[PDB]
Each structure stands twice: as C-alpha cells, then as structure tokens.
Amino acid sequence: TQPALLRLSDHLLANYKKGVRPVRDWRKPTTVSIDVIMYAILNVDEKNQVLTTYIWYRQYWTDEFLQWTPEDFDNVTKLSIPTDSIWVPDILINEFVDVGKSPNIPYVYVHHRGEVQNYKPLQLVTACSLDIYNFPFDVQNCSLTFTSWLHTIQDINITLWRSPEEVRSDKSIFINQGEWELLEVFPQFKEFSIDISNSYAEMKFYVIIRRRPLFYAVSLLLPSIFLMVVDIVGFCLPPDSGERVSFKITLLLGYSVFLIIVSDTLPATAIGTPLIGVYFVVCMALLVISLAETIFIVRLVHKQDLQRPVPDWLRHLVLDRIAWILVARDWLRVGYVLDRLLFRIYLLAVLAYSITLVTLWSIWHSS
Amino acid sequence: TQPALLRLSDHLLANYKKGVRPVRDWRKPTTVSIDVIMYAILNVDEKNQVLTTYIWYRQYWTDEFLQWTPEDFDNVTKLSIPTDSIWVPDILINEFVDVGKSPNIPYVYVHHRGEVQNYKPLQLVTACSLDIYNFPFDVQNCSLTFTSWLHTIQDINITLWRSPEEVRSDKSIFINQGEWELLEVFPQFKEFSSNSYAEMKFYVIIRRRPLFYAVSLLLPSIFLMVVDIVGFCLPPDSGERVSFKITLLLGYSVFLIIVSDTLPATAIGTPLIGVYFVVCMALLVISLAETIFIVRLVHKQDLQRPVPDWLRHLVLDRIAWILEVARDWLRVGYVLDRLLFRIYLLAVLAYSITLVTLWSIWHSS
Amino acid sequence: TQPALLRLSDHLLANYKKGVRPVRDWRKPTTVSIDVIMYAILNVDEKNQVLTTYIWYRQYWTDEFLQWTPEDFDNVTKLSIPTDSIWVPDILINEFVDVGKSPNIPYVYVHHRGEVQNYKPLQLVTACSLDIYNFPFDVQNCSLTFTSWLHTIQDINITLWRSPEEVRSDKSIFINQGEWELLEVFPQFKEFSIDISNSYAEMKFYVIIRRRPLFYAVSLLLPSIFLMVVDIVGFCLPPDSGERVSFKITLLLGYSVFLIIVSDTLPATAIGTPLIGVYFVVCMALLVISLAETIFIVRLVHKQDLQRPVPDWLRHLVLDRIAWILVARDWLRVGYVLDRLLFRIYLLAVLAYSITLVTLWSIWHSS
Amino acid sequence: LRLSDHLLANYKKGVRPVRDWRKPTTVSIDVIMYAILNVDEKNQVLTTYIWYRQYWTDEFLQWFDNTKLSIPTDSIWVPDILINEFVDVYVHHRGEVQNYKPLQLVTACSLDIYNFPFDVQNCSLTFTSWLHTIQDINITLWRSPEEVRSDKSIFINQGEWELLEVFPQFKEFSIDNSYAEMKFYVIIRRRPLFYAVSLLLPSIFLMVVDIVGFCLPPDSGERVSFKITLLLGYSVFLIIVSDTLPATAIGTPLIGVYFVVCMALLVISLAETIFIVRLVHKQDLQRPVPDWLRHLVLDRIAWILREVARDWLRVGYVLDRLLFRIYLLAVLAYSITLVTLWSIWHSS
C-alpha cells in the first residue's frame, strides 16, 4: 500500500479548499500568533527613510480542517505541506516598501489535532521615521506593524506567541557587531478602528536602534575637536604677525577640505542636518571672518594703505568694545581689539561645541 | 452540517467562469472604480528616466454572479475569495515598466449584492521627463496613468472611488521627510482615443527638498568660492601664492569629485550649477598658470623684452581703464591678476543670483 | 511512436506529489549529500557585518518514487525533470540575508532507479564577524551553515558528497583575481535544538579569505610612513623658535586626511578604528600637544612676553626627572627640554608603529 | 488565439521537444551588446545590459484561426543555454520559434587596470550547455560568424565605457562526455576625460609647481614654507588618488606609481632643505664631517658625466641640483608614460 504520508496528504488535501478561512463556525475568529526575532539591521537609510532589517518570523494558527488522528495513519504525528496549498493569514507589514530578497520557505509544518506552524525569514525593507539631530549619538526608534490587510478583527486577531517580557531582550541570534546595536524590541497592541464597527486588528513592535558612535567619535569628532582647539590656539600668535597670517592661511587651506569631506559624510534629511553639523558651518564662518580680518590688518601693516584713511566710524566703537571685553596705531589697536573679540567668539563656540557633545553623549548613554 | 463558508464558496464558484464579464446583460459595461494614495517615492533617477513609487492601489466593482442571501448561508454577510478564481478587471498601467516586488494580497472581499473590493500595494516603476536642470531645486511633474488593456469604454468604465478633493488632499500616509515632497496628486480623466477605453491619469507632482543638499553641496561650494575670493588678493603675486593656488586647486579637485558622486549626470549633461563649478575650476586653473608663468619671468629677469609691446598698449588703454625690465612684466601680470579677480567675483555673483532665482521659482511652486 | 518517449515523464509525473518526503517509510530519515564549489567573492561590504559570495552548489538524494527502468523505452537510462515537479529539501544557508538572481536553473536531472541530482549556480549574502582591527593585512573568517527549516534530523540529514579534505583542497573553479584571495574552506557538521524536543541536523563550511594588502599598503601604509618620517626630521632639525608651527599644523592636517581616507575606505565598525588608525590618532594628539606647547612657550614667552618666570615647578621637574633622564633664556631652555621629551616619545611612537606593521604582516603572511 | 489550447494540451511545458530520441537538437543565439553600464574596476565584475536573442527549429510542434503565434514561453520549453560567468541577471507555423530578452549581466572578467585611466580591457562572455544538454549538443550563431555583429553595433551608451570589437568563436569541450559552447569577446575603452581633468591635471600641476620650487634659493626658508604647503598639497591629493584609483590584484596602476615616486622625492627634498637651513652660519654648529664623503659629494659638481660656512652651502647647492635633476627626469618619464598610454588607447 502507499506510504502513510501519501495517504495522509490525500486525506487532508484531496478536498481542501484554500482561501476559505479554516474554521467550522464562521463567526468564531481565527487566532494568529506571531514572533519576530531580529537578526541584523542591514541598513538605516536616513536619506530615503528606509530601515532595512533581516528578521526571523514565525506564525502559529489553528486550522480545523487539517485535523486528523495518528492512530489511523501509521501513528504519524507531523506532516509537511506546500505553503501555497493551505490557507495562510493575510498578515502584511504596513510600513513596508519592498518584499526584499527573502529566501522562500515552500513548506509549512502541521501537527495532529489541528495545528499549523510557519517559519519564514524576511529581509524587510521597512519605512521608518529617523532623527539625526543627535549625531553620531542618535538613539532611534522604529516600528513594525502587522495587520490583516482585509480581514477585520472578527476574522483575524493577532497575538504574541512569547510573553511581552521575553520578546523584549530576545537579542539571542542578533549579530551584535554591526554599526547599529539592537537595544530592545518592544511589542504593543492596538485594535485600530477605521469606522463605526469595521475595526481591524493590529500588532506593533518597536525596534530601538542605537548607533555605535565610536567610529564616528574617532573620525568626525576627534579631528574636528583638534582642528578647532588648534585654531583657537592660533590666536596666541601675535596679532597679524607673519606667523599669524601664514598659520591662518595654511589652517584654512587644510581645514576647508577637511570640512568638504566632513559635510559630505554627515547624513542629511528634511528634518535637519545634525546638530554637530551647525558647528562645522560655524567654524567655516569663523575661519572666513578670521582670514578676512587678517587681510585688512595685513594691508595696514604691509601696505601704505589703511594708515592713510582715518577710521571714519566713531571711536565710540573702541571704548564700547573694550568696555564689553574688559592713525596707523589706532588702526592697529582696532585690529587688536577685533582679534580679541574673535578669540572670545572662538572660545565661546568651542565651549558650546564640547558642552553639546557631552550632552548628546549623556542622552545616548541615558538610553 | 457543512461549514457555511465552504458551501457558500462552492455555490459561488461552481458555475463561475472568467470567460464572461461580471454582468449578465453582456452589452453593458462593468463600472470599475479606482483610488490611489501615494505612500512613498523611493527613487527618481536620470539614468533610466524612471520614477519608482509605492502606492496603495484600490479597485472596486460589482459582480452580478456573486449575489447571495446571507439569510440562507448562515447569515454570512461577507466572504473572502481567492483572486485567482474571481474575474478581475484587466487594468493596464501605461507609462509603466515594472511592477516590482509588490506583496500582492491573494484574496479580495465580496459582499451580499456582489460588491467587490480589491486592495493591493504596487511598487510601480513609471517613466517620466526628468528635466533635472534646476537641480537641486527642481519641481517635477510625472504622469501616472491607468488604462483598460482591451475593454473599450462600452465594456469597462474607469472612475474614481472618491472625489478628486480627497484624492489630492489624502497625503495622510505619505512617508514624508525623504528627499522628495509629494506636492499633489492631480486626477484627470478623458477618453483613451469610436470604441475608446475610459483612460485615466493621476499626475504625481513631486518637489525636491534642497535642504538635503544645502550642507552636502551648496555650503561647501559657497565656502570654497569665498575662500578663493579672500585668497586672491591677500598674498602678493610674487609671494609664492602658487602654493596656495595649487593646494586650493587640489581642494576644488577633491570637491568636484565629491560633487560628481552627488550631481546627477542626466542625459542633457550636468545641471545648471555644474556650469558654475566648471567656470570656477577654469578660472582657478588660469590663475595658477598665470602665477607659475609670472614667477618664471620674475626669477629669470634676462628676458629680451620688458613687455609684450603690441598687447601692453591695449592692456593699458582698456583693462586698466575698466577696473629691472622684469618690473614691467610684473605690472602686466598684476593688471591681468586684477582682471581675473574681478572676473571671479562676477562669476560668484552670477552663481549666487542664479541660486536665489532657483530658490524663488522652487518656493513659488 | 516517438512521443512514447514522453511516457517516461507521464508515468512518474501523474503519480508524483511534491508534498510528500519521498521515502519508503517516514521513520526512515532522508539523506542529502552536498558539494559546494566557490566563485570569486564578489565583495566584502558593510565591512562590519556582511559578506557576499558566489558558489556552485550540489544536492544528491534518493527518491523512492522516481523509480523506473530503461527497458520501458529504448533503454533510456536518464531523464531531465522540472524542479516544479519534484520534492526538494529546503536546505537554506542559515546566515542568509539576501538571495540573488542567478540563472536559477529550471531543470533537475534524475537517474534511472531514482537517484536524483541537482546542479545550480547560487549566489549568497552572508552575515559574518570581521577582524577589521588588523587592517589592512586582514585574514577574515566567515561561515556558511546549511539546515532545513522545520525538518528535524529525523526528516532531513546532511552530509558532504566529496571527502572533507577534497572540499578543503578543491579551489579549481575559483577565479583567483580580485581584492580578496580565498585561503581555505573547512567543512563541519553538528546539531542544534531551538523549537524541537529532538534536534535539527546541521552542516557548516568555514570559507577563509585574506584581502591582498597590495593597493591598501602602497596607498595608506607607504605615504603614512613618509609623513611620519617627515615629522621625525621636523621635530629635531627646525629651530625651536623657528617657523615650526606651519610645518606641524601641515602634518597635523596630513594625519587628519589620513583619518579621512581610512574612514572613506572603511565604514563604521564596532571596533572603533584599525590598529593602524589608532596610531594616526596618537600621532595627531602628539602633534596637537607639541604645537600648542611650542606656540605658547616660545612664541609668547620668549619673543614677546617679559622676563616672567614660573620657576619652582619647572626647576623641580628638570632637577628631579630631566637632569636624570637627559628668565627668557630659561623659558627657551625648558622649551628645548620639552622638545627633546616630545621627540623621544614620538620616536617611540614611530617604533611602535613599525613594530605593529611588521607584526600585522607577520600574522597575515602566516595565515 | 484558439489553436494554442490543443497544442499546449498535447505537449508539456517542461520536456525537451524533439521528433525522435537520440537525435541531438540544436539552438541558435544572437546578442546585441546593448549599453555596457559600469565596470566595477575591482578586477572582478563587468555590469552590462546586453540584449539576447534565441532561435531554434526544434520545438517539435508545427502547423486554424487563419501563421504567427506568441503564447509566452512560460508555457513552453526553453533551452538551457546560460552565460557561464552569470552573476545576477514568438513562433512561426513552420515550427521555428523566436525569443528576445534583455539581460543585465553582471558577468565576471579579468580586468587589466594598468594603463589607468587609458584602459583597454579584453573581456569574455560564454554561452554553454550544462544540464538537459544532450551529449551531441550543438550551438549555432546568428549572422555570419564574426559578421554584421562584429562592428557597427547599436552603441547606445557612452556615459563612461566606449566598447569596440566583439569577436565570436565557437568551441566544443569534453570533460571525459561532451559540452558545446560559444565564446564572445568584447573590448571596451574607458572614457579618460573625467579622470584626466580630475586627477592627471592636478598631478602634472604638482610636478610643475614642485619643479618651480627648485627656483627658490636652496638655503631660503621660503623653500621650507613652499615645500610644506606642497606636502599639504600631496596630502590632500592622496584623497583624490585613494578615491579614484580602483583596488587591484597588481597593487596600483602604472600611473599610480609615479604618485608615490614624487611623494618620496618631495619628502626627501624637505630633509635636504631643512639640513641646509640648519647648516647656515648662525646655527650650523660647524657640524664637522670626515671630508671624504664631502669631497665625493663636492666632486660631483665636476663629475656629472662665512667662508667656512660656504662649504656646507656648496654641499647644499650640489645636493639641490642633483635632486632637481632626478626630479626633472621623473617628470619627463611621467609625461612620456602619459603619451604612450594615450597613443595605445587611441590606436585600439
């Protein structure tokens, strides 16, 4: 006689009709139980707002027609059935933009007295909402939403196979050496109602994804800190002596290309460029202002030029400046007090920058 | 005895066939209704002139063969039925080149009195005129049309499910803050052109956000141009300014490299501001070559002539009027350098004016 | 007559049923025999987490239902069958994160008496833990793991079809050229349990590779050596009062752009920066401190400041430490002392950099 | 429309059509080299958007409905022919069948990035029979072998790669048991203009200005400042180099050797200048030497083929002129290299 698996697959599928939701009493909902195990954050595309994540996804649902007794079929207990030959739930991720190159699992595993298991892995290209105002210390929160695309809550209800205390902190298979460290996966449930009684049934997972700053802390933050602290130090060179002008020249001449590549490598989104990114633009501004000062004072010392005009705006400006801070020689005094003002501006800017970085790190570590 | 949904699904399908329209009066059209809400614009690329989108496309119709009375079928008011078995209106999207990885739902709803709904997301790749010329401030206008593949209007009529007011204003799920703002979706509907399909066209109008490119491109550009302006006249011309000029040329070379990774190489060539990048590179190269040339003469000094006498007269009569022997070549070089500096300042002014104009047109949209 | 050739299909295909694992008794395991042959690594990318590989891959198993004899027609000994029609063990690469549009051969080839042979080009994307710290002379170790989902060890069992050492030695199809050179491939089998009281069955390979440090060496390692030498000369030979500042800031900018180059070459990683990169940070910090100290002490206090001493700390330090280990004139003298101190530690840093590069090359070549 | 149903009922999708067994069956192939897209230049893969065409007379069926049919061959058997290095990708009543499809072949090839950016590469596409093959398989080539296809192709794209000679040749192989294959060899130019303006022009300008640096007096601190700023120039230039040059098994392209040569020459030139600025009357410390090396240095002034301080100034002068001469020789060797590479690239 034919083997039990053939006779059983005949007994089950020879009159099975997929599409009909598998319940004898139609008015009873089916109940569907889902788990996601995160495996890898393959990307977080800030520009496109797409988190691409690889997960391991399992469904469990009870089907009253795939129901049979081992006693009549050589005591066989499980079977493997082609996935497209039984009903499967309508559960799609809402915030989803590409099926991805997921490896398909063509069979689903079925257990006597009517049970179904389906295990499949999804290279989700999700869609997500991302904040880069903190950078590189961003703590980012991304959501996965699972819903019956047509079936209302009277037909499909969505449930967590593991308790919420353990879907969180699962981080078991997770390849935790990527750029992004998985902090938690947190699950939340909502009966979305679209109108008076056609409430849908929806399940939510939130995936909290903290950047590991250390590479960016070395590459972006430490070079910028050194070039800023050395530029402030340059003020200690005597005002507009040959050293000062040459120093400011070469410093601008290298820092400008450093800033080109830095401003390339910072992410950007419509929400805004990173908070540290405004301080690099501020350093661009203060470099420009510095060199534009030196060209004025260099002409004063170098040429027989600015010594010939008087400073036609009131000397009131000078006593005002010194009152806040504390004719060629009058021009030189103006240059000196302007240089001291610019140094004060640099020191303020670098204090604000370091306080910002420590604030961002405190926030990131508080998470 | 029999489960209600099974005997119902059998009763529907047992006499069903896809070879006939969903209507018994074969002469009448089926009245399809359509709706679209745009979810995301994933890419626009000049390389293929294609627009890649994601849309929650919806179909609605009535099937005169799917009537049933729930009072018989155990009060089942509605059923889910596999899309392979039921007839589906063969709408073809035109201006269309791939359906992509659309996670299609295998079932459609049906109800008592046979009204049908079919929701499927589509990752449409459309094709469009990508005049990127205004980059990065470009406003683009991409037609996304729907057509009957063979049904003449007398067989299928295509309608919106809801007023253009909501189809235009229902941006409610658009995943904003990406590179492209969805400015609007505009429905328009005319004959597909005796037997013509009732074709329809929703015009996807999308506006690039410059703030992505502000720091990536615009601010480094302006910074480099101001750097060159400040550097042009600070060093004396004999003061080995060649070192500054060459190192900044390297910096403008390391910049243009970053700017070709960024700037779209569309079929018309690079966008407008690529012209001002090339102009600035050219003027910088010219200034460097001038500085190199004059340094040779000022160190050589044994040159057999103090000036290019034929040109010197015009240089004085016009260039200086608009704005041992090695000293005269130095004077000529100084006048040329002042000319080139003024040309650079004019070029940066023109670039800034065009940038503000592009912003003004983009914001007026 | 000749369409009777089609008999050899029709007699099987009308009776075959993909849903059943093709064994005489379901208590029998099903036994699957594998060869994997390797085609150039297309890239290592996302250098913190991801590997991409191209492979030529074999399955053989016995099918109890494709049983037939050549005498049924003209002694036809072998036949080709579409995989659309035959049961296939769903042996996935467990590390999958993407699967790739290889030709994906439609057909599978079967012997008389129901031996079954499957040959397919296959393209893999794989998640792996990367020794980025020893860059550039790296010897990555990457894993490929093979298991059927849902199928227990009692359903599916996996074995090499070659000898183990034959797989390790067989590189015949590997095209040799590229940034990465495959070293050795190691095959291993074990078991695991996760959602079963018994266990699954697991067969794993350990592809090894070592990127050719030719381009990375010349580009970053060589110029770096030259610049470090340029600083080794620029520390001693320029006078302490001289225009050292422009030199040191220029080489600081040098190291900053080497950090840029590495950061472009090498994306964000859990390990902060390659061992070599850490030395660029150390050199940059030494340059920053040396430039700041020289600027303040000589170029304020000697050239411009009055005869203002700070004796006790300076005198104490020189008499206790420097005099063992070795006004304005004394400021210049302690300037020279600090120069020698910074020169000695910087020379030691150059020695450490050389020792690391020779130690990195030693490890790489010995792989 | 109507006649297809009995045809697709009487013969199955998935089995090789033939009138009789043991008869080998023969397949004919055509390719248009449509739009080469991007050479990875990582000496590994060759992305292309070829257009591929197949004909075979052997679909077993022949012929209602009043001559051409086009039921898609998702319903009909298709020959096994595939590209070998194949990473990531109508019918007539006489019984002869026609299929056209476009393939985004990633391919694989042994690139020869040595003349960079004036590359010419010779690169392979192979079409081969692997399973379901038949022992006596034979493969057939449209248009006369190496005829009509060889030249005047459609040439759709030039955005980065030019493309040139496409040589068809056909071959049969036996592993013990025989396979039949067609071989297509395709030849492409890099477009050098972008790389020329973005890398070669900065490079040659650095050669020129560094040569100009030798016009400054050998003892002057102006040389120190100049050379320092040019060392910054090269430091930033290495960003250009490391971005632009692709990784390769050979290490670096031939152009990319002269970069490190000039870097080394500049670096050693700094030490010379720094020594001579040290060996100046106010700070030379009269640093003595045992004269023999000094005479063997000074006599090079003849053997080409304060007053005490002048000794070291003359040493500095001769070292300067020697280093200038070796720098000049490197500039000429570079220029001749560029002219040679350009001439080769233009002639092919």
Swiss-Prot record, chain D:
Q: Name one GO cellular component term.
A: cleavage furrow
Give the glycosylated residues.
66, 122, 138
Q: Keywords on this record?
A: Cell membrane, Disulfide bond, Glycoprotein, Ion channel, Ion transport, Ligand-gated ion channel, Membrane, Postsynaptic cell membrane, Receptor, Signal, Synapse, Transmembrane, Transmembrane helix, Transport
Q: Which CDD domains match?
A: LGIC_ECD_5-HT3A (cd19011), LGIC_TM_5-HT3 (cd19063)
Q: Name one GO biological process term.
A: inorganic cation transmembrane transport
* Residue ranges that the UniProt entry lists as topological domain Extracellular: 1-191, 243-252, 346-348
- What remark about domains does the record contain? The HA-stretch region of HTR3A seems to be responsible for the low conductance of HTR3A homomers compared to that of HTR3A/HTR3B heteromers.
**What is the annotated role of this protein in its UniProt record?**
Forms serotonin (5-hydroxytryptamine/5-HT3)-activated cation-selective channel complexes, which when activated cause fast, depolarizing responses in neurons.
> What is this protein's name?
5-hydroxytryptamine receptor 3A
**Source organism per UniProt:** Mus musculus (Mouse)
Its taxonomic path starts at: Eukaryota, Metazoa, Chordata, Craniata, Vertebrata
Q: What gene makes this protein? A: Htr3a
